[PDB]
């Protein structure tokens, strides 16, 4: 294998990204099942490592050996209000190891533990094999992407993660200022640049102020909601057809894992489909005691049951405003990223509180992120 | 009487995904044989219950490909006019229920006390 590019990596919570830049643009990169995301699950069982895909694909049956949110715990002492909080959720285990906190797991029928920059270094290493399989070439290069509120451990801790996954990482880059590279808002001519970053993922909600003077980024301002995303939104649909099932039949699904389960897929895709139409169906027979549940919502229904949440996205923004010491009309620019910014009603919030300002979304939301990266990539190759 | 094209494109559908709940049924069939030969063998109390737990990653995996087969189908609408098409559906996931109901059985049987 002759030696190739450097990657442009998005190490997420849950999905990272890779992409890469030949032939004047840039080219997000699909794994091995065709997918151009890819989870950050790491699974041990009794004969192998299973990472991405195939990981995610088996948690239902080796729950407390497959490790996801390493990020969350990255860089991290055990005794931060993070790690003590999301520790109570997680199925893995997580030990204490001299201040440092370490996943514990099952690998091999052995008890093995992990540090978080272990766990993601073994993701970093399926990002660099899924360039490697698309270029046909070998990878080692790369510039790896962090948020904006990460300290010099979290930073630092990333870098290891780089280094054990034998990557040469380039530059560290803040996630925001990747999004806003991606849109070449850097090279725009004209006096410096207020840029709103606006993501919104399936578990994470991070809003970031950059003012760009003369090449230079700034973040002026972060502000968020560690635990709002799109599984939020399929939480409230869940419950609507809970209470549709009860109203209709009499029935209480909510104690039937595996109806639960075929409900919230369902309505996971029928959300999806209610960005592009203003209705989707849902068609699943014998879902509980045998009675077949054939429904559909509406855009302005799922839009109600939802209300509170999506408007709620805009408290961080004004939040965000206030710290950068700036009005709303001192905004140059508004990027989107996170596959939750897809949906209609956030856009149509976000645009009508900048009085009708156009957002940046042509790049996937998913992927802008990647995109930034591997531009930077390319540049310091 | 008024079969149309559009419903074959669905049937072909349900076939392949009846040749994929017969692949998944041949392996529980498997792991009953060998439930079965566990039972009936000549292993001590000690390395029985090994055994029968060493079946448990395998009727656990038998279930989620069932479960993925059922999300696959759920992917599916079928207008009311597709008469063959819902009873071919409606058939399969009683299939895989009937079978998901057999995984359950094994699943109380090894990895007990
Ligand atoms: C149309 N369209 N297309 C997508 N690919 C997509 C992903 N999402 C959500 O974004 C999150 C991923 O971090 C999960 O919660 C997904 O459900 C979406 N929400 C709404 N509309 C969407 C998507
Ligand atoms: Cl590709």
Same mark, same amino acid.
């Given at each position: 294998?002759?030696?190739?590019?450097?990657?442009?990596?998005?190490?997420?919570?849950?999905?990272?990204?890779?992409?890469?830049?030949?032939?004047?643009?840039?080219?997000?990169?699909?794994?091995?099942?065709?997918?151009?995301?890819?989870?950050?699950?790491?699974?041990?069982?009794?004969?192998?490592?299973?990472?991405?895909?195939?990981?995610?694909?088996?948690?239902a049956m080796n729950p407390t050996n497959t490790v996801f949110d390493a990020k969350r715990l990255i860089g991290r002492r055990f005794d931060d209000a993070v790690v003590q909080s999301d520790m109570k959720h997680w199925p893995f285990m997580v030990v204490n190891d001299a201040g440092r906190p370490k996943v514990?797991?099952?690998?091999?029928?052995?008890?093995?533990?992990?540090?978080?920059?272990?766990?993601?270094?073994?993701?970093?290493?399926?990002?660099?094999?899924?360039?490697?399989?698309?270029?046909?070439?070998?990878?080692?290069?790369?510039?790896?992407?962090?948020?904006?509120?990460?300290?010099?451990?979290?930073?630092?801790?990333?870098?290891?993660?780089?280094?054990?996954?034998?990557?040469?990482?380039?530059?560290?880059?803040?996630?925001?200022?990747?999004?806003?590279?991606?849109?070449?808002? +850097?090279? !725009?001519?004209?006096?410096?640049?207020?840029?709103? =970053?606006?993501?919104? @993922? #399936?578990? %994470?909600?991070?809003?970031? &102020?950059?003012?760009?003077?003369?090449?230079?980024?700034?973040?002026?301002?972060?502000?968020?909601?560690?635990?709002?995303?799109?599984?939020?939104?399929?939480?409230?649909?869940?419950?609507?057809?809970?209470?549709?099932?009860?109203?209709?039949?009499?029935?209480?699904?909510?104690?039937?894992?595996?109806?639960?389960?075929?409900?919230?897929?369902?309505?996971?895709?029928?959300?999806?489909?209610?960005?592009?139409?203003?209705?989707?169906?849902?068609?699943?027979?014998?879902?509980?005691?045998?009675?077949?549940?054939?429904?559909?919502?509406?855009?302005?229904?799922?839009?109600?049951?939802?209300?509170?949440?999506?408007?709620?996205?805009?408290?961080?923004?004004?939040?965000?405003?206030? +710290?950068? !010491?700036?009005?709303?009309?001192?905004?140059?620019? =508004?990027?989107?990223? @996170? #596959?939750? %910014?897809?949906?209609?009603? &956030?856009?149509?919030?976000?645009?009508?509180?900048?009085?009708?300002?156009?957002?940046?979304?042509?790049?996937?939301?998913?992927?802008?992120?990647?995109?930034?990266?591997?531009?930077?990539?390319?540049?310091?190759? | 009487?008024?079969?149309?094209?559009?419903?074959?494109?669905?049937?072909?559908?349900?076939?392949?995904?009846?040749?994929?709940?017969?692949?998944?049924?041949?392996?529980?069939?498997?792991?009953?044989?060998?439930?079965?030969?566990?039972?009936?063998?000549?292993?001590?109390?000690?390395?029985?219950?090994?055994?029968?737990?060493?079946?448990?990653?395998?009727?656990?995996?038998?279930?989620?490909?069932?479960?993925?087969?059922?999300?696959?189908?759920?992917?599916?609408?079928?207008?009311?006019n597709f008469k063959d098409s819902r009873l071919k559906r409606k058939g399969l996931v009683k299939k895989v229920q009937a079978f998901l109901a057999e995984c359950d059985t094994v699943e109380q049987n090894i990895c007990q006390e």
């Amino acid at each position: 294998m002759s030696k190739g590019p450097a990657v442009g990596i998005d190490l997420g919570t849950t999905y990272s990204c890779v992409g890469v830049f030949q032939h004047g643009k840039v080219e997000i990169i699909a794994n091995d099942q065709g997918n151009r995301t890819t989870p950050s699950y790491v699974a041990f069982t009794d004969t192998e490592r299973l990472i991405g895909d195939a990981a995610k694909n088996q948690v239902a049956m080796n729950p407390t050996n497959t490790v996801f949110d390493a990020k969350r715990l990255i860089g991290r002492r055990f005794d931060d209000a993070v790690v003590q909080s999301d520790m109570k959720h997680w199925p893995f285990m997580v030990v204490n190891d001299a201040g440092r906190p370490k996943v514990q797991v099952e690998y091999k029928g052995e008890t093995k533990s992990f540090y978080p920059e272990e766990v993601s270094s073994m993701v970093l290493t399926k990002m660099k094999e899924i360039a490697e399989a698309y270029l046909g070439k070998t990878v080692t290069n790369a510039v790896v992407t962090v948020p904006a509120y990460f300290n010099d451990s979290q930073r630092q801790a990333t870098k290891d993660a780089g280094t054990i996954a034998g990557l040469n990482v380039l530059r560290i880059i803040n996630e925001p200022t990747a999004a806003a590279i991606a849109y070449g808002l +850097d090279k !725009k001519v004209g006096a410096e640049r207020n840029v709103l =970053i606006f993501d919104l @993922g #399936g578990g %994470t909600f991070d809003v970031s &102020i950059l003012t760009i003077e003369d090449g230079i980024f700034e973040v002026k301002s972060t502000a968020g909601d560690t635990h709002l995303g799109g599984e939020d939104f399929d939480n409230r649909m869940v419950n609507h057809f809970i209470a549709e099932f009860k109203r209709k039949h009499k029935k209480d699904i909510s104690e039937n894992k595996r109806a639960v389960r075929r409900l919230r897929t369902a309505c996971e895709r029928a959300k999806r489909t209610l960005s592009s139409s203003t209705q989707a169906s849902i068609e699943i027979d014998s879902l509980y005691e045998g009675i077949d549940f054939y429904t559909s919502i509406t855009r302005a229904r799922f839009e109600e049951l939802n209300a509170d949440l999506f408007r709620g996205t805009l408290d961080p923004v004004e939040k965000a405003l206030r +710290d950068a !010491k700036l009005d709303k009309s001192q905004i140059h620019d =508004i990027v989107l990223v @996170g #596959g939750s %910014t897809r949906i209609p009603k &956030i856009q149509k919030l976000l645009q009508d509180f900048f009085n009708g300002k156009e957002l940046n979304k042509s790049i996937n939301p998913d992927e802008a992120v990647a995109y930034g990266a591997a531009v930077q990539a390319a540049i310091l190759s | 009487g008024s079969n149309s094209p559009q419903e074959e494109v669905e049937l072909k559908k349900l076939k392949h995904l009846e040749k994929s709940v017969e692949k998944i049924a041949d392996q529980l069939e498997e792991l009953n044989k060998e439930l079965t030969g566990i039972q009936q063998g000549f292993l001590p109390k000690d390395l029985q219950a090994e055994a029968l737990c060493k079946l448990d990653r395998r009727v656990k995996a038998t279930i989620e490909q069932f479960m993925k087969i059922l999300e696959e189908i759920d992917t599916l609408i079928l207008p009311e006019n597709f008469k063959d098409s819902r009873l071919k559906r409606k058939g399969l996931v009683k299939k895989v229920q009937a079978f998901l109901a057999e995984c359950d059985t094994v699943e109380q049987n090894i990895c007990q006390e």
